[PDB]
Design a binder for this molecule. Structure first.
Ligand SMILES: [Mg+2]
Ligand SMILES: [Mg+2]
Ligand SMILES: [Zn+2]
Length: 1207
RNA sequence: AUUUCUACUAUUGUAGAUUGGAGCAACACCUGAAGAAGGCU
RNA sequence: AGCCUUCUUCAGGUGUUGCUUUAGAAAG
DNA sequence: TTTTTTTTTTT
DNA sequence: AAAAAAAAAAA
């Protein structure tokens, strides 16, 4: 029943909030009762916030780091000179894996640590820890120095720009090196490592340690931090802090990913490759790769993806993961690290058949090279040889191409046409050589003429003849250079897409998409989980949430820096139960913590376990069967009862009061049941109180007080209107259903120059990115990791979709549901028709409009809504859901109200239309102009020569830019925007032709934000209509996956193939490319399906489509069968075949119809016309007004008719 | 005016949408280079 | 010797379509 | 039952 | 109507 529509999946959600107070006069003041401390903390945070320059900076930082490393390497073992603070000693005892003991001094000299722990002196653990850090940072110094010297010699010679390393690996190698160096430098500069025994005079023999004890390490710290902040700033946001609200997580160690690393290495079959390839030299590994059968190894799915990759295209292993990986796999296997590094450097060594034939023609073989490499060489050199003598192995190339295609390639009309076009291009290039004209141009003119008159086309190209006439007219008579250049460019576009199109080669390239994607995926995951080893400090701050009497909420976070004192303790000791400010913490527990408590207990003779409080006296603990046999020992009942006893009756359970979580392990007969109970129940929002004097003492001690701000929690009247603010106020009810994750990150965005302080981009914006979790409390819920496991397997995903829509169809079978069909297009971006379950068209939708009403008291100005129309089948293009001032949710047509030409002009009239597809049309025109600025810059600059009028400027654009493809041609061209762009380009070129300034103009504007925002309006409409029918509905969509024919690109005139010609061609993306990147079909699908899986009803999440992550999780699903029409059920959403939805009569169901010039549907076999809307018909067929209405009606009707038979 | 996006208003704002961080793969063009082939003077 | 076109490769930038990983306490 | 054409759109 | 042609479904 209705419980089939509740959510059983755990969901993560990021709720970003502002952390900077806007101080305008048109912004309501908030956070007033701690405003002085907020200002103090903001001044404190503002102080410590921010390829040739980057690498000069990297060289200086590298030299300073090497100097520090060489000096520190001779001093770390000097226990008679080094001392540590007490809190730094406690953190060291955690990090170096020894027991701190009891210390009665505030400054603990390492000479005083003569006590023996587990067979070694206490200071020997510290010295061994520093030696291990020195070794690790020495390795990463070598690794970073290699890349730095490579990229330096690349920049210092102009001839070596092809030798630059990958920038991502350069940045990440420096980040690891910076972490390892900072591990020593930050305590040294903080004073946590000091040299107290130095005041005595030993300058004649101890000058090195005296010099090192004073170096002002804050300078090296600042340089490292500056480079770190430069690297970490992506998208305008720089990471600032990582704050935790659970203080048991503040001293977190890096997570160990050894099982995932081993599994990924096992998937790569990397160990077998190193075994077969070690002992070989570099030329011997090259010979091994040369002797492979490329085609059979490429199609053998049981090979390494590394080997399968190297036999289509050369792809080296990335630098950082290769150096981490060789060191990881060498020492366990008994191998030398240099030998395995030599093996990994030789994988993907790029080799050129043209170069190899140039140097030595004997022993040459095209079978030595990858398929794409040898194909490119053979194809290009065979195409040239049809008209001239070319130094290349002709018979070998012919055999190679014939073996791929199964026919004689040099006789194929496609290859012959390619060779003809290439010969024409060559002779034109001879005639165009302005530096050196030929002395006898008639030879090349006659060559071009004879080549054009002898071309046999392999297929029909309608515009080839006019290109031929333009080129021939310019070379013979010289009429018009513009049409000649356009024809030459279009023949270049024709020639470019001609290569490989004689289906086997397309199949191989489509396979390489998946193969190289798997290769990159696995190496990126391995790189990410190797970097975690050196992520020593993960939590930077410990914080609490503070609330005052006005419900303004703050974050008070203390930095966990190495000092004399404990910071977690200095906050926790200032909380009372009788003070004036409310405080919140997260008290929680996970199975992730439980496994770390279980597996890391030590039961040896001399050791003192950090986890001895968790472990009781029951018999279930066996260290050998926990370390070596965990997956088999965890299914024993003795371990289950031991873990239950540890969770119920241990010292940790009684000190931390785990009885407050309300666990019940009586029905838990497994370890996984215990995990599920802990994950479902272990959350509390712990409320204490703090005083203003305590906050005052903490803020001058270095704590940061940040306000938590969004638009409607800091407004005058503070009703929650966004879903984020409703979620935010739902967290502080303390329920387990909706949780606050204890860990979150703080970032900042520096202001953009040219923006006022009144707008957010002229302001230093701090952002707190809180994470919320939806954990279902009603039964067996499904966690995030299980979801990731299911999304990676397509068969499990198919089974899950099948069972989900089985429950869905059972729930709705006997109810009076409706079917909502949505058509998609360009004239109407979406059209919506609701059908009764017997097929009757439903709908008397009230369509509203807005007027802004100025009030006498100016703060009381508001919008008023009046009903404008009544519509049955809805064009969703210009509609949006609005809440009126009375609180009623209505449908408003945004196009019925005019907007103002200039913003913030209250006394001006509104005169401009507000159609939403015109926005997409204008952005497409802007992107087309930018593309032509990149490729045809002089043709773009010629549009504004003699200061043309708007009409002449329009007709000059039409010879350069193609039309949008819907409506009248060039109907809404953004003339004033485009002319300003061309003027700015002309200004930049006149000021010295700087490339960065040009890139700020000619690079394509992103289309995703605009069409996401436009789609979101229609998604809100569909959610409103779905809620209107009490969620008893099915949604019917077209399966727009197949392209029936070709298209032309929106950027060039370039041909786009069909799905029959290239199996990976999608109709939605072909339509996207035709519109120069402004198609909204897939955005509509993805946003609708993401809306339908997390629908809110005021406290509860309702799920209507199955769980999915990627686009291949709702695509690639089973089809419903034994039905009238083909359909793919995805929950309540059905994807029907789009065939004969627009070309069908609503009355007689015949397909001999046509759409009139006004998009009126006319039937040629029964006289039906959509213009006769006053003649009432059965099933409200007279509601259909267009061909889009007809398409939406038939989209709904196919799903209606197969839902009748299906249930 | 915004956590942010889209459309607005000038209402100490309004309406809808909103899961963030780091990346990987293919394609398009631009910029900096290299190798090869053929051609011109 | 100077230069041109063509093909391929390397690095980056910007777009377009996709796909992963990460997001609660680690002693042999 | 075979076969061709069907989602998009304009001049 | 067209338009470098596959699987679904009209005749
Ligand atoms: Mg449609
Ligand atoms: Mg349509
Ligand atoms: Zn009819």
């Amino acid at each position: 029943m209705l419980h089939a529509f509740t959510n059983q999946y755990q969901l993560s959600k990021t709720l970003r909030f502002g952390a900077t107070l806007k101080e305008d006069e048109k912004k309501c003041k908030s956070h007033e009762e701690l405003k002085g401390f907020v200002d103090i903390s903001y001044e404190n945070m503002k102080s410590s916030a921010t390829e040739n320059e980057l690498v000069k900076k990297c060289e200086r930082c590298y030299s300073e780091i090497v100097k520090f490393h060489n000096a520190w390497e001779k001093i770390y073992y000097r226990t008679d000179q080094i001392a540590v603070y007490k809190d730094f000693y406690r953190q060291l005892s955690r990090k170096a894996r020894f027991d701190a003991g009891k210390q009665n001094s505030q400054l603990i000299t390492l000479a005083s640590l003569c006590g023996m722990y587990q067979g070694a002196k206490l200071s020997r653990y510290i010295t061994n820890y520093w030696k291990d850090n020195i070794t690790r940072q020495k390795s990463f110094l070598k690794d970073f120095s290699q890349q730095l010297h490579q990229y330096t010699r690349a920049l210092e010679k102009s001839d070596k720009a092809h030798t630059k390393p990958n920038l991502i690996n350069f940045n990440k190698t420096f980040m690891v090196l910076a972490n390892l160096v900072n591990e020593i430098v930050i305590p040294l500069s903080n004073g946590a490592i000091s040299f107290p025994n130095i005041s005595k005079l030993e300058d004649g023999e101890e000058s090195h340690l005296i010099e090192f004890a004073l170096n002002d390490y804050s300078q090296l710290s600042e340089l490292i931090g500056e480079l770190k902040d430069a690297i970490a700033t992506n998208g305008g946001y720089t990471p600032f802090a990582k704050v935790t609200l659970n203080h048991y997580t503040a001293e977190q160690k890096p997570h160990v990913f050894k099982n995932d690393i081993d599994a990924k290495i096992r998937e790569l079959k990397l160990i077998g490759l190193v075994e077969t390839l070690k002992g070989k030299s570099s030329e011997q590994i090259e010979e091994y790769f040369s002797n492979l059968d490329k085609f059979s190894t490429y199609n053998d799915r049981n090979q390494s993806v590394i080997v399968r990759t190297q036999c289509f295209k050369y792809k080296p292993i990335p630098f950082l993961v290769k150096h981490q990986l060789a060191k990881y796999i060498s020492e366990p296997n008994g191998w030398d690290e240099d030998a395995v590094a030599k093996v990994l450097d030789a994988v993907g060594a790029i080799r050129s058949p043209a170069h190899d034939y140039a140097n030595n023609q004997e022993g040459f073989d095209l079978n030595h090279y990858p398929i794409k490499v040898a194909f490119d060489y053979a194809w290009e050199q065979l195409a040239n040889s049809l008209y001239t003598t070319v130094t290349f192995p002709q018979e070998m190339c012919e055999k190679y191409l014939n073996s791929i295609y199964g026919c004689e390639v040099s006789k194929e009309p496609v290859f012959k046409f390619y060779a003809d076009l290439l010969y024409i291009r060559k002779n034109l290039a001879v005639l165009e050589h302005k530096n050196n004209l030929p002395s006898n141009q008639e030879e090349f003119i006659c060559k071009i003429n004879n080549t054009f008159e002898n071309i046999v086309l392999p297929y029909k190209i309608s515009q080839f003849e006019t290109y031929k006439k333009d080129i021939l007219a310019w070379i013979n008579d010289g009429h018009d250079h513009k049409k000649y250049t356009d024809a030459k460019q279009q023949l270049g576009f024709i020639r470019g897409g001609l290569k490989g199109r004689i289906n086997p080669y397309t199949k191989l390239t489509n396979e390489f998409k998946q193969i190289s994607s798997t290769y990159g995926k696995t190496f990126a995951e391995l790189r990410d989980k190797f970097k975690e080893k050196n992520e020593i400090t993960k939590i930077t701050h410990f914080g609490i949430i503070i609330e005052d009497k006005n419900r303004d909420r703050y974050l008070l976070a203390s930095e966990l820096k190495h000092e004399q004192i404990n910071h977690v303790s200095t906050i926790l000791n200032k909380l009372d139960k009788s003070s004036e400010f409310i405080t919140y913490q997260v008290k929680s527990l996970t199975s992730k913590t439980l496994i770390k408590l279980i597996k890391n207990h030590t039961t040896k003779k001399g050791a003192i376990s950090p986890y001895a409080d968790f472990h009781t006296s029951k018999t279930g603990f066996n260290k050998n069967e926990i370390e070596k046999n965990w997956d088999n020992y965890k299914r024993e009942q003795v371990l289950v009862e031991y873990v239950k006893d540890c969770l119920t009756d241990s010292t940790m359970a009684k000190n931390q009061n785990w009885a407050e979580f309300g666990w019940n392990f009586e029905k838990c007969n497994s370890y996984e049941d215990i995990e599920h109970e802990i994950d479902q129940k272990s959350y509390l929002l712990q409320s204490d109180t703090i005083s203003k004097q305590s906050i005052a003492s903490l803020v001058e001690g270095g704590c940061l007080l940040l306000p938590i701000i969004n638009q409607d929690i800091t407004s005058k009247e503070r009703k929650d209107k966004n879903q984020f603010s409703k979620d935010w106020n739902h967290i502080f009810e303390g329920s387990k259903e909706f949780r606050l994750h204890p860990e979150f990150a703080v970032s900042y965005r520096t202001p953009i120059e040219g923006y006022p302080v009144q707008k957010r981009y002229g302001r230093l914006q701090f952002v707190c990115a809180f994470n919320a979790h939806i954990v279902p409390q009603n039964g067996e819920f499904i966690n995030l990791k299980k979801q990731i496991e299911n999304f990676n397997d397509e068969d499990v995903q198919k089974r899950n979709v099948t069972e989900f829509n089985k429950k869905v169809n059972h729930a709705l079978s006997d109810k009076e549901y409706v079917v909502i069909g949505i058509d998609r297009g360009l004239k109407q971006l979406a059209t919506l028709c609701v059908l009764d379950k017997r097929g009757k068209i439903l709908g008397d939708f009230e369509i509203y409009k807005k007027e802004f009403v100025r009030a006498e008291k100016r703060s009381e100005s508001h919008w008023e809504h009046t009903q404008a129309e009544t519509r049955h089948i809805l064009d969703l293009s210009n509609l949006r859901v609005e809440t009126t001032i009375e609180g009623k949710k209505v449908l408003v047509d945004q196009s019925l109200t005019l907007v103002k030409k200039n913003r913030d002009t209250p006394d001006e009239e509104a005169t401009e239309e507000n159609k939403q597809k015109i926005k997409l049309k204008q952005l497409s025109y802007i992107r087309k102009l930018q593309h032509k600025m990149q490729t045809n810059e002089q043709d773009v600059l010629d549009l504004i020569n003699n200061e043309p009028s708007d009409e002449e400027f329009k007709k000059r654009i039409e010879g350069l830019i193609s039309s949008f493809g819907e409506g009248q041609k060039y109907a809404d061209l953004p003339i004033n925007t485009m002319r300003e762009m061309i003027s700015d380009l002309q200004g930049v070129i006149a000021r010295g032709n700087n490339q960065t300034e040009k890139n700020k103009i000619i690079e394509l504007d992103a289309a995703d934000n605009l069409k996401q925002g436009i789609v979101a309006n229609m998604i809100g409409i569909v959610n409103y209509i779905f809620a209107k029918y009490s969620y008893k509905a099915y949604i019917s969509l077209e399966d727009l996956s197949r392209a029936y024919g070709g298209a032309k690109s929106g950027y060039d005139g370039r041909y786009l193939p069909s799905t029959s010609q290239d199996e990976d061609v999608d109709f939605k993306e072909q339509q996207n490319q035709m519109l120069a990147g402004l198609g909204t079909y897939q955005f509509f699908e993805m946003q609708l399906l993401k809306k339908l899986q997390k629908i809110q009803s005021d406290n509860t999440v309702l799920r209507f489509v199955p769980a999915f992550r990627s686009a291949d999780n709702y695509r690639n699903i089973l089809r419903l069968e034994e039905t009238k029409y083909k359909s793919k059920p995805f929950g309540v959403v059905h994807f029907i075949d789009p065939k004969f939805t627009s070309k069908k009569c609503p009355v007689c169901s015949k397909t001999n119809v046509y759409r009139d010039k006004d998009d009126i549907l006319v039937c040629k076999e029964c006289g039906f016309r959509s213009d006769s809307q006053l003649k009432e018909r059965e099933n409200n067929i007279h509601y259909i007004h267009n061909g889009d209405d007809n398409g939406a009606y038939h989209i709904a009707l196919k799903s209606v008719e197969n839902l009748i038979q299906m249930k």
